[PDB]
Design a protein around this motif. Structure first.
Motif, mmCIF file in Angstrom:
data_model
loop_
_atom_site.group_PDB
_atom_site.id
_atom_site.type_symbol
_atom_site.label_atom_id
_atom_site.label_comp_id
_atom_site.label_asym_id
_atom_site.label_seq_id
_atom_site.Cartn_x
_atom_site.Cartn_y
_atom_site.Cartn_z
ATOM 1 N N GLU A 11 44.571 55.392 -41.391
ATOM 2 C CA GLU A 11 45.749 55.722 -42.184
ATOM 3 C C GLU A 11 45.612 55.446 -43.676
ATOM 4 O O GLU A 11 46.326 56.027 -44.471
ATOM 5 C CB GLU A 11 46.968 54.929 -41.675
ATOM 6 C CG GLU A 11 47.264 55.292 -40.241
ATOM 7 C CD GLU A 11 47.910 56.646 -39.970
ATOM 8 O OE1 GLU A 11 48.144 57.040 -38.862
ATOM 9 O OE2 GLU A 11 48.237 57.346 -41.003
ATOM 10 N N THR A 26 55.881 59.551 -46.513
ATOM 11 C CA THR A 26 55.362 58.363 -45.873
ATOM 12 C C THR A 26 55.080 57.319 -46.923
ATOM 13 O O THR A 26 54.957 57.617 -48.102
ATOM 14 C CB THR A 26 53.968 58.838 -45.287
ATOM 15 O OG1 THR A 26 54.205 59.965 -44.512
ATOM 16 C CG2 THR A 26 53.193 57.850 -44.418
ATOM 17 N N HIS A 31 53.391 54.643 -42.568
ATOM 18 C CA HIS A 31 54.783 54.521 -42.130
ATOM 19 C C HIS A 31 55.625 55.752 -42.523
ATOM 20 O O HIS A 31 55.974 55.947 -43.705
ATOM 21 C CB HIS A 31 55.400 53.233 -42.739
ATOM 22 C CG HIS A 31 56.821 53.091 -42.263
ATOM 23 N ND1 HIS A 31 57.168 52.392 -41.089
ATOM 24 C CD2 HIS A 31 57.992 53.567 -42.805
ATOM 25 C CE1 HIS A 31 58.490 52.502 -40.915
ATOM 26 N NE2 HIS A 31 59.012 53.173 -41.940
ATOM 27 N N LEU A 66 55.823 46.274 -42.761
ATOM 28 C CA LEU A 66 56.132 47.520 -42.033
ATOM 29 C C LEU A 66 55.069 47.829 -40.953
ATOM 30 O O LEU A 66 55.392 48.251 -39.806
ATOM 31 C CB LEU A 66 56.121 48.755 -42.961
ATOM 32 C CG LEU A 66 57.306 48.720 -43.902
ATOM 33 C CD1 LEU A 66 57.357 49.967 -44.809
ATOM 34 C CD2 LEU A 66 58.556 48.741 -43.062
ATOM 35 N N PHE A 67 53.813 47.626 -41.330
ATOM 36 C CA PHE A 67 52.695 47.941 -40.420
ATOM 37 C C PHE A 67 52.777 47.088 -39.183
ATOM 38 O O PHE A 67 52.709 47.579 -38.046
ATOM 39 C CB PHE A 67 51.378 47.717 -41.159
ATOM 40 C CG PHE A 67 50.114 48.077 -40.384
ATOM 41 C CD1 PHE A 67 48.940 47.341 -40.573
ATOM 42 C CD2 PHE A 67 50.040 49.230 -39.592
ATOM 43 C CE1 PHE A 67 47.719 47.700 -39.995
ATOM 44 C CE2 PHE A 67 48.839 49.603 -38.984
ATOM 45 C CZ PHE A 67 47.691 48.828 -39.174
ATOM 46 N N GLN A 69 55.338 45.805 -37.905
ATOM 47 C CA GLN A 69 56.462 46.219 -37.090
ATOM 48 C C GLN A 69 56.151 47.485 -36.347
ATOM 49 O O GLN A 69 56.571 47.704 -35.196
ATOM 50 C CB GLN A 69 57.699 46.544 -37.953
ATOM 51 C CG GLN A 69 58.308 45.283 -38.529
ATOM 52 C CD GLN A 69 59.312 45.580 -39.623
ATOM 53 O OE1 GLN A 69 59.881 44.641 -40.142
ATOM 54 N NE2 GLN A 69 59.541 46.853 -39.954
ATOM 55 N N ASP A 70 55.496 48.379 -37.058
ATOM 56 C CA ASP A 70 55.146 49.639 -36.393
ATOM 57 C C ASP A 70 54.135 49.453 -35.244
ATOM 58 O O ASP A 70 54.228 50.119 -34.238
ATOM 59 C CB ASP A 70 54.567 50.635 -37.414
ATOM 60 C CG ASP A 70 55.640 51.079 -38.397
ATOM 61 O OD1 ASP A 70 56.844 50.948 -38.254
ATOM 62 O OD2 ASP A 70 55.147 51.610 -39.445
#
Ligand SMILES: [Cl-]
Ligand SMILES: [Cl-]
Length: 162
Positions: A11, A26, A31, A66-67, A69-70
């Protein structure tokens, strides 16, 4: 190597809102913020996700949060999915990372639709699954990445990422 590193490779990391391979807004490490064409709509979802007025830019730490969490959500989605769980449960650790990678990119729904491949994976018919996985829009649109994930399922090693 592990899931985090593996996805960080596929990513990348960007600190300003960008358009992904499908043209969607994104940020961070893949994300997705929104499928909407509106940049404002994007900035809005971003601020809501971060908890501050970001003005479309975040820090590294925020991207990493964020990562985390994802990735968590992805794993949990797989475990709650009736069609996916069994697959995941049957796999070895390296291969489980491959399956998480696909879910993170395309959603559990997306992945669960690869019915035949999933079956093949469950049965440990590695070469057959790899061939079937390749007959997909997924492979045709992001072939380098898809090859990496496919090799990983085919070999049970991280060689495609070394
Ligand atoms: Cl979020
Ligand atoms: Cl690619």
């Amino acid at each position: 190597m592990n899931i985090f590193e593996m996805l960080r490779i596929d990513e990348g990391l960007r600190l300003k809102i960008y358009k992904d391979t499908e043209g969607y807004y994104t940020i961070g490490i893949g994300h997705l913020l929104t499928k909407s064409p509106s940049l404002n709509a994007a900035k809005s979802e971003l601020d809501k996700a971060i908890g501050r007025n970001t003005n479309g830019v975040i820090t590294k730490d925020e991207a990493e949060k964020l990562f985390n969490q994802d990735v968590d959500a992805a794993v949990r989605g797989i475990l709650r999915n009736a069609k996916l769980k069994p697959v995941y449960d049957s796999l070895d650790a390296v291969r489980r990372a491959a399956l998480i990678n696909m879910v993170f990119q395309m959603g559990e729904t997306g992945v669960a639709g690869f019915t035949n491949s999933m079956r093949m994976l469950q049965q440990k018919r590695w070469d057959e699954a790899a061939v079937n996985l390749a007959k997909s829009r997924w492979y045709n649109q992001t072939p380098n990445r898809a090859k990496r994930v496919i090799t990983t399922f085919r070999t049970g090693t991280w060689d495609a990422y070394k």
